[PDB]
Amino acid sequence: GSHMDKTFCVVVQNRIKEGYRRAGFSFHLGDNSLAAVSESQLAQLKADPRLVVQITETGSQEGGEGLSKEPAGSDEQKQLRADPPSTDLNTFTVEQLKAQLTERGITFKQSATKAELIALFAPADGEKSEA
Description:
Blueprint: E1 10-13, E2 31-33, H1 40-46, E3 54-55, H2 95-104, H3 115-120
Antiparallel strand pairs: 1-2, 1-3
PDB class: structural genomics, unknown function
Assembly: monomeric
Entry title: Solution Structure of HI1506, a Novel Two Domain Protein from Haemophilus influenzae
């Protein structure tokens, strides 16, 4: 096979959805195999705290790794950390937007029919925020 090198094919078994995306390969809901690379694969797949990355070396029962912990260790910033709020735009029905836009200084006669004025209200005042 190979020697004097650390090349392995890795696969990410995910059970999220068919739209979680990734680096840019339209990662679907399932397992994707990785080509035999030095180590970038592992770090690239592990760098993303969403999917899983496991190395499978068919021909080496050495190691085992006695490291169970990893997520924890010197906590500095977290704040709850469990489930995304997702409670911001929801509070905006239809009559609020139209009443808030005008009261906010954003008239709407031609545009902002109903689907535009309800979507308009987005928390991104600055340059390019992602809330």
